[PDB]
């Protein structure tokens, strides 16, 4: 190895020289810049210069002499004959100059920290570096003060390295070893170098324990180790047990036999991604991960996966990784920030010192506007005294160019001293504040709403010059109130808000003449002006939000065919109507009828448009193959006339009271007569049948009288639900002119009001609010009931099997426990029979198409699982600045029979723990079965590289086994064994705890197999795994038996009902919101001009990444109404349980079911329930790839609850507890929204980093700051609503509702609204939320916000909930804030 040692010594000699050149370079530029440039112009004092830099000077001379003395030996270049030792030995005494420096260094750092707290001094100190020629963003002065103390400590290491290479024959050898004793003793006598030496000693020590090392030494690229340990490197090829060392810029991994090098990664070219427990992969080499994360070398494009034994070690590793990332990134962003701002502060100062006539350099000179010459600027910098050397000036002028303060006029040149023409980026207007102007709408709406939500209002009637003004706010009281709520820190900021509100037409002074001031002047929102009727007469009170037309409509869905959708349109009586429906078309199958008026085409209100433009909308939808969504005029009762054929029917009927159309044949005379599925038959040839069976209806028809059940006729049948289409298909698989007049009731009708308004863009807009009966509700309630019956069939079947393994009854406590268990199994049996019946009831019911609030209490029935008064409030909007959006807010009565009082919440939390523990233990054994298969696969492919891979796999198997032992050992299983203590089993609690001795023996036998006979390894694995499977099943069995015993079957029946009502409403809400989004119609972000396609795609990808948030305006009066309190105490516990629900999606076509994009299905136990939203090919293909691949979408819930009236009088001790319970609900909901907001923020940070043109990332970041600044405001507000500070309490009113509405709207939640009836309080919140959505997102002119809010609560489609529930007593809120009351009509006349 002679040539190696030869070239290696030359490399040490080069490293000494090369690193000293740049280090003395460092000392030279710092001396030049700091001392001389600080004295030219001035805040730093003479003594402060002395303390900072002067001990550099005394070092610097010794180091220049040392550099010369080294460069003299190493002439003309470093050569193998050279000596240096004597040059150290002579300098050894000269290096004792460090004794003063080190004694002062602590004082110099301690000065620098304080001088960096003073903005001017920090900027002056960075300026020194900038003019010198050093990029400020690359090295800190904070580092430079240490850099001398580092390099004296390096000299011992430098000698040690030269000594590693040089042979004993070389004459420098004895000098170098003497010089090592010297440079060591030098650094050892001084505390500061001793510290730097011991911290380097650790790095060299570790490197000395590592063999095989590649790349640069640890001392030279890292300051400290951060973390050390063994992990499983899962990698391409196969798994590798390894040691991992993390150091401050470098991760290095080694084979563990002291250690042997394998490879290293710079923490810059690293990237990290987390993976969830139970995840497995394709396009990555792994298996069922738990306790892992993924690493990406961005330089080599290499993924690999770490795994740790425990979660605690996963967390220790990801936390150290995150910290190292944040420390490096925070220095870099802190230096870039600090540096940019001083360049700005100087740039602006010097700009406004150049714009005065004392200087005037910025002149016009093709003609070039507002320019200057670089020579003159540098000269002027020397003349004013800002520089000492012209070189500094070209450094500053190039820095102001590269930082964007200036540029060249011709698009050619950098900055030069050279009479070249330049210009400041001020001149073309590159700076502005307009982000404070777009947010003034949102702030305005949020403000108006909070003020009018006050129970003791601050906007009110007040007299001026002894004459009443009606709805006025003193400008100074507005300021006092903006401040008291924390919206603005200063009165000045509140005045700036006030001025911009007045400019954007929110409010005015009581005379035209004044701006907003902090004076006693009176101010009034135009939204009151329009409602109290207080315009001057010559403006006619133009109602710029008005009603257009009330609609009653059936929603159809049509998939495109070979030439069209299956129909034509015509203009008739100045309306668009259905001209002709093609026989046997998918439109006929939807139930489109000839002569019907059409209210919307893909949510565009086509009745408002010219006929030639509507044909173009149909065509554009068809050309883009969109699934068509109509609204068509349909009456609540209808007359249909059927040809009575002699041989066969063409339709099916069933249902008792009322009878209903179960099915109809495609292309039939019945279908062409307009018979359609779900129609509930009232009369036949005049004869009433509304309480008469399907046979009585069928008996009118000649074919039925002839053939009875055989009367069906070999048509392709179409059906009322997918449930009916399934039971028909299954029935098929198990087997392989005279007239009649029907008067029918059309179920599933949407009642709508088209509002018109003029937008803030000055253009006309329409809103289609609809109250919709959720078509799926009865079918979905049956499917959830079926799923609970299926789960309970699996539960009863397991627990009966276990009681059949316990053959003996040895003691009376065994008999008592068995009798309890037998009874509870029979009870769950009775529950299974009930839910199958109730599902058959619900499948056998079609009217009323929503649960009315029950007129009377009664014993339990199938409708008690459907949500009471469940209706979806759609709100479609037509083009602002052609845009379409479709907000969804479901309304229901709060679900009803509370649970939070009935449950010892401990029982629920134990039952969660048991059902999750059982689900986990079952998954962990399911992986363990696949693991033994993957090892047998590897062994077949094999029959030291193979040994490393195999050892990694076998270790990972034992890790999985530990990922079971930690579940079986736990306190949850121990408590289960204490509950099941009467039941006979093969193991006691003491046994399994002691059976870690069985896994220690098994591991030792596997290791013995690896050492003595590698072909006995499968037998050893099988033995270990079979023993563990017996323990896992014995755990599963104990947990189902503990569950059977601790389940209260009566409460569970209730819970299921509340859950079923809630989940149905939730799933219906999300169904509608999902179908809006998958239709390119959801948009929480219409404020920011955003195209609804993009907003929808962003929400879909967001929901895939984050979960669905369901937000409930709980809107119950628990302090006052005992019924509503029981509904609150139920829904709170229930939404906590709905958090465990996972949505998921699958493609499934029909063309055998009318009008249903979605067919739900349900899988999984109560805990971890899964809803499969079966979607059509079109909507499924608009899912994100995460959800298309079958992955689970998690539901998060929040529930915000404020009384819409005041509480009058002092609360009783019970009412105080109701308010406290209300406050707890709001607290838990605030934490859960904040988490969803954090997970959205994190998701947006990742999204902004996605590999794209850097200009688009910068624009995205500037965009995303506005939503986030508004959201952070809404969070501050929510915290002050939910946790009011001492003495601010009561001052906030019901504002929690419009504000938590705004929050969960902004986040993109599915929105739900509830009250004891679902038919009055709910109208007041939905009407406000919709009016606020219009005002904050679609630019409804702010003067109209209350007008829409009251018109909606008077004339909107919601009054139809009262005209469908006339028998239900409800109370319009008398104690409500002016935002929630109806406004009385104006008293002064002139309407």
Q: Rounded to an integer, what distance in angstroms lies between the CA atom of residue 739 and that of residue 643?
A: 5
> Residue 575 CA to chain centroid, in angstroms?
44
- Helix, strand, or coil (residue 652): strand
Residues 6+ apart with CB under 8 A from 329: none
Cα of first residue to Cα of last residue in the chain, in angstroms, is 107
Rg over alpha carbons for the chain, rounded to the nearest Å, is 39
Q: Rounded to an integer, what distance in angstroms lies between the CA atom of residue 1306 and that of residue 1267?
A: 8
Judge whether 355-424 and 555-634 match in fold. Answer: no
Domain 637-745 has CATH 2.30.42.10: yes
Ordered by start, the domain boundaries in the chain are: 2-189, 355-424, 437-538, 555-634, 637-745, 777-894+1049-1205+1213-1362, 905-1046
Structure tokens at 236: 């391409």
What is the enclosing helix (H) or strand (E) of 307? strand 302-307
Residue 1192: how many other CB atoms lie within 10 Å: 17
8 Å CB contact between 30 and 1? no
Give which of 1085, 582, 1122 is closest to 901, Cα–Cα: 1122
Q: Rounded to an integer, what distance in angstroms lies between the CA atom of residue 567 and that of residue 593?
A: 10
Give the architecture-level CATH label for domain 355-424.
Answer: Orthogonal Bundle (1.10)
Q: Rounded to an integer, what distance in angstroms lies between the CA atom of residue 1273 and that of residue 851?
A: 39
The CATH number of the structural domain formed by 2-189 is 1.20.900.10
**The residue to which tokens 């006092």 are assigned:** 480
DSSP string, 952-973: HHHHHHHHHHHHHHHHHSSHHH
- Helix, strand, or coil (residue 255): strand
Residues 6+ apart with CB under 8 A from 769: 752, 753, 755, 873, 874, 875, 1330, 1352, 1356, 1357, 1358
The CATH number of the structural domain formed by 437-538 is 1.10.10.10
The CATH number of the structural domain formed by 555-634 is 2.30.42.10
1056: left (phi over 0), alpha (psi -120 to 50) or beta: alpha
Q: Rounded to an integer, what distance in angstroms lies between the CA atom of residue 613 and that of residue 609?
A: 7
Q: Rounded to an integer, what distance in angstroms lies between the CA atom of residue 777 and that of residue 779?
A: 6
Q: Could you tell me whether strands 637-643 and 739-745 are parallel, antiparallel, or unpaired per DSSP bridges?
A: antiparallel
- Helix, strand, or coil (residue 1115): coil
8 Å CB contact between 225 and 247? yes
Structure tokens at 36: 């001389």
Structure tokens at 1358: 């919601």
Give which of 96, 112, 108 is closest to 193, Cα–Cα: 96
Q: Rounded to an integer, what distance in angstroms lies between the CA atom of residue 550 and that of residue 770?
A: 10
Residues 6+ apart with CB under 8 A from 1095: 885, 1082, 1083, 1084, 1085, 1086
φ and ψ at 490, to 5 degrees?
A: -120, 150
Buried b (16+ CB within 10 A) or exposed e, 999-1018: beebbebbeebbeeeeeebe
Q: Where are the alpha helices (DSSP H) in 301-432?
A: 311-354, 374-384, 390-402
Q: Rounded to an integer, what distance in angstroms lies between the CA atom of residue 483 and that of residue 501?
A: 16
8 Å CB contact between 577 and 570? yes
Query: Which 3-state string (H, E, C) describes 1001-1038?
Result: HHHHHHHHHHHHCCCCHHHHHHHHHHHHHHHHHHHHHH
Give which of 659, 669, 671 is closest to 696, Cα–Cα: 659
1318: left (phi over 0), alpha (psi -120 to 50) or beta: left
Residue 848: how many other CB atoms lie within 10 Å: 16
Query: What approach was used to elucidate this structure?
Result: cryo-EM
Give which of 122, 363, 345, 42 is closest to 377, Cα–Cα: 363
How many helices and strands (H and E) does the chain possess?
44, 37
**Which DSSP symbol is given to 1342?**
G
Q: Rounded to an integer, what distance in angstroms lies between the CA atom of residue 528 and that of residue 448?
A: 10
Sign of CA dihedral 791, 792, 797, 803: positive
**Which DSSP symbol is given to 357?**
T
Structure tokens at 214: 């590649």
Torsion over CA of 531, 533, 539 and 545, rounded to 10 degrees? 20
Structure tokens at 298: 């961005």
Give which of 456, 347, 352, 326 is closest to 397, Cα–Cα: 347
Q: Rounded to an integer, what distance in angstroms lies between the CA atom of residue 406 and that of residue 1360?
A: 65
What is the enclosing helix (H) or strand (E) of 1195? strand 1193-1200
Structure tokens at 804: 């059949």
Structure tokens at 934: 């993957």
């Amino acid at each position: 190895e002679s040539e190696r040692q030869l070239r290696l010594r030359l490399c040490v000699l080069n490293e000494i020289l090369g690193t000293e050149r740049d280090y003395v370079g460092t000392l030279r530029f710092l001396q030049s810049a700091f001392l001389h440039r600080i004295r030219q112009n001035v805040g730093l004092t003479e003594e402060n210069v002395k303390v900072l830099f002067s001990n550099i000077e005394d070092i610097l001379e010794v180091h220049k002499d040392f550099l010369a003395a080294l460069e003299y030996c190493l002439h003309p270049e470093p050569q193998s004959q050279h000596e240096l030792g004597n040059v150290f030995l002579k300098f050894k005494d000269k290096f004792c100059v460090y004794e003063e420096y080190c004694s002062n260094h602590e004082k110099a750092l301690r000065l620098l920290v304080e001088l960096n707290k003073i903005p001017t001094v920090r900027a002056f100190l960075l300026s020194c570096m900038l003019l010198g020629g050093r990029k400020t963003t690359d090295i800190p002065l904070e580092g430079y003060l240490l850099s001398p103390i580092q390099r004296i400590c390096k000299y011992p290491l430098l000698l040690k390295e030269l000594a590693k290479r040089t042979p004993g024959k070389h004459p420098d050898h004895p000098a170098v070893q003497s010089a090592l004793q010297a440079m060591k003793t030098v650094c050892s006598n001084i505390n500061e170098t001793k510290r730097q030496m011991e911290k380097l000693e650790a790095l060299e020590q570790l490197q000395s324990h590592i063999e095989g090392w590649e790349g640069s030494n640890l001392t030279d690229i890292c300051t400290q180790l951060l973390l050390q340990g063994t992990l499983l490197k899962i990698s391409a090829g196969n798994i590798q047990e390894r040691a991992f060392f993390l150091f401050d810029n470098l991760l290095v991994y080694c084979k563990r036999k002291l250690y042997i090098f394998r490879g290293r990664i710079n923490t810059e070219v690293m990237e990290v991604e987390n993976v969830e427990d139970g995840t497995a992969d394709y396009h990555s080499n792994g298996y069922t991960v738990t306790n892992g994360w993924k690493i990406h070398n961005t330089a080599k494009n290499k993924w690999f996966v770490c795994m740790a034994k425990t979660a605690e070690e996963k967390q220790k590793w990801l936390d150290a990784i995150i910290r190292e990332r944040e420390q490096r990134e925070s220095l870099k962003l802190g230096m870039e920030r600090d540096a940019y701002v001083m360049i700005a502060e100087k740039g602006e100062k010097l700009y406004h010192m150049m714009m005065n006539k004392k200087v005037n350099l910025i002149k016009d000179r093709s003609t070039v506007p507002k320019c200057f010459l670089g020579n003159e600027f540098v000269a002027w910098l020397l003349e004013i005294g800002e520089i000492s050397k012209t070189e500094e000036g070209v450094n500053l002028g190039q820095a102001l160019l590269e930082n964007g303060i200036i540029h060249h006029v011709s698009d050619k040149h950098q900055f030069k001293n050279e009479q070249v023409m330049y210009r400041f980026r001020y001149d073309d207007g590159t700076y502005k504040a307009r982000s404070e102007l777009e947010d003034i709408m949102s702030k305005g709406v949020r403000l108006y709403c909070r003020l009018h939500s006050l129970y003791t209002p601050v906007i009110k009637d007040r007299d001026y010059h002894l004459k009443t003004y009606k709805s006025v706010l003193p400008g100074s009281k507005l300021v006092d109130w903006l401040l008291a709520q924390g919206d603005c820190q200063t009165r000045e900021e509140a005045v700036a808000l006030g001025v911009g509100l007045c400019n954007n037409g929110f409010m005015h002074h009581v005379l035209e003449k004044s701006e907003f001031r902090d004076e006693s002047q009176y101010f009034r929102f135009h939204a009151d002006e329009e409602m109290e009727g207080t315009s001057s007469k010559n403006k006619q009170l133009r109602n710029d939000f008005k009603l257009v037309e009330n609609i009653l409509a059936k929603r159809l869905l049509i998939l495109p065919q070979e030439e069209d959708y299956g129909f034509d349109i015509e203009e008739k009586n100045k309306a668009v109507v259905v001209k002709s429906v093609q026989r046997g078309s998918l439109a006929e199958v939807a139930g489109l009828q000839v002569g019907r008026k059409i209210y919307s085409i893909n949510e565009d209100l086509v009745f408002l448009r010219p006929f030639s433009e509507v044909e173009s909308i149909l065509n554009q939808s068809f050309c883009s193959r969109r699934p068509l969504r109509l609204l068509v005029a349909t009456k609540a009762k209808e007359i249909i006339k059927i040809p009575d054929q002699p041989d066969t029917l063409c339709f099916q009927i069933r249902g008792a009271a009322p009878p209903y159309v179960y099915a109809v044949g495609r292309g039939s005379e019945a279908m062409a007569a307009g018979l359609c599925a779900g129609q509930c038959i009232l009369k036949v040839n005049g004869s009433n049948v509304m309480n008469d069976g399907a046979p009585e209806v069928l008996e009118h028809f000649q074919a039925f009288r002839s053939r009875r059940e055989e009367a069906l006729g070999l048509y392709q049948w179409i059906y009322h639900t997918h449930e009916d289409a399934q039971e028909a298909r299954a029935s098929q698989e198990a087997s392989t002119s005279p007239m009649v007049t029907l008067t029918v009731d059309n179920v599933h009708l949407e009642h709508g009001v088209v509002y018109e308004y003029v937008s803030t863009a000055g253009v006309r807009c329409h809103v289609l609010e609809k109250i919709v009966e959720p078509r799926g509700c009865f079918g979905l309630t049956a499917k959830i009931l079926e799923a609970f019956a299926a789960n309970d069939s699996v539960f009863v079947e397991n627990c009966r099997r276990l009681m059949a393994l316990s053959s003996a009854i040895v003691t009376m406590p065994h008999f008592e426990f068995r009798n309890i268990c037998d009874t509870k199994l029979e009870s769950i049996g009775q529950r299974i029979a009930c839910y199958q019946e109730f599902a058959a009831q619900l499948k056998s019911r079609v009217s009323p198409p929503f649960k009315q609030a029950p007129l009377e209490p009664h014993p339990l029935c199938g409708l008690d699982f459907c949500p009471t008064n469940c209706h979806i409030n759609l709100m479609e909007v037509s083009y602002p600045k052609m845009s379409y959006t479709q907000h969804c807010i479901t309304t229901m009565a709060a679900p009803s029979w509370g649970l939070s009082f009935l449950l010892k919440q401990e029982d629920r939390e134990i039952q969660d723990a048991y059902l999750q523990l059982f689900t986990k233990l079952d998954v962990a054994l399911k992986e363990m079965k696949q693991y033994v298969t993957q090892i047998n696969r590897l062994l077949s492919t094999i029959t030291s590289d193979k040994q490393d891979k195999l050892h990694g796999c076998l270790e990972h198997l034992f890790n999985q086994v530990d990922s079971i032992n930690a579940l079986l050992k736990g306190p949850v299983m121990s408590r289960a064994f204490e509950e099941t203590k009467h039941f006979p089993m093969n193991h006691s609690l003491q046994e399994f705890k002691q059976k870690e001795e069985c896994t220690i023996r098994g591991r030792s036998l596997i290791q013995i197999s690896i050492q003595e006979d590698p072909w006995n390894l499968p037998n050893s694995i099988k033995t270990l795994v079979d023993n563990i499977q017996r323990y896992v099943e014995d755990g599963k069995n104990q947990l189902l038996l503990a569950l059977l015993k601790c389940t209260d079957t009566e409460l569970q029946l209730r819970r299921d009902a509340i859950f079923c009502q809630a989940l149905v409403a939730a799933v219906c809400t999300f169904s509608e919101q999902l179908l809006a989004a998958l239709g390119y119609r959801y948009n929480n972000n219409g404020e920011y001009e955003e195209s609804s396609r993009d907003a929808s795609r962003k929400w879909l990808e967001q929901v895939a990444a984050t979960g669905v948030l369901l937000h409930c305006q709980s809107l119950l009066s628990p302090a006052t109404v005992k019924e509503e309190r029981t509904m609150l105490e139920d829904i709170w516990v229930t939404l906590s349980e709905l958090d465990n629900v996972t949505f998921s999606f699958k493609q499934l076509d029909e063309n055998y079911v009318a009008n249903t994009n979605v067919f739900y299905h349900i899988e999984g136990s109560r805990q971890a329930l899964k809803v499969i939203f079966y979607l059509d090919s079109y909507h499924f293909s608009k899912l994100p790839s995460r959800l298309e691949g079958g992955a689970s979408l998690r539901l998060h819930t929040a529930l915000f609850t404020k009384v819409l009236e005041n509480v009058e009088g002092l609360p009783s001790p019970g009412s105080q507890a109701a308010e406290d319970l209300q406050q707890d609900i709001n607290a838990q909901s605030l934490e859960k929204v904040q988490q969803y907001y954090r997970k959205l923020r994190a998701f947006y940070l990742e999204r902004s980093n996605l590999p794209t043109d850097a200009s688009t990332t910068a624009v995205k970041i500037d965009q995303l700051i506005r939503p986030i600044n508004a959201l952070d405001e809404l969070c501050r507000l929510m915290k002050s609503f939910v946790h009011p500070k001492p003495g601010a309490a009561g001052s906030v009113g019901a504002g929690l509702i419009p504000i938590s509405s705004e929050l969960c709207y902004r986040l993109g939640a599915c929105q739900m609204v509830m009250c004891g009836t679902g038919m009055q309080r709910s109208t007041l919140s939905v009407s406000l939320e919709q009016a606020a959505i219009l005002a904050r997102s679609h630019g409804l002119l702010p003067k109209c916000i209350m007008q829409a809010t009251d018109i909606m609560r008077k004339q909107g489609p919601r009054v139809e909930i009262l005209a469908k529930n006339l028998r239900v007593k409800d109370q319009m809120p008398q104690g409500a804030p002016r935002l929630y009351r109806l406004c009385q009509p104006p008293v002064d006349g002139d309407l």
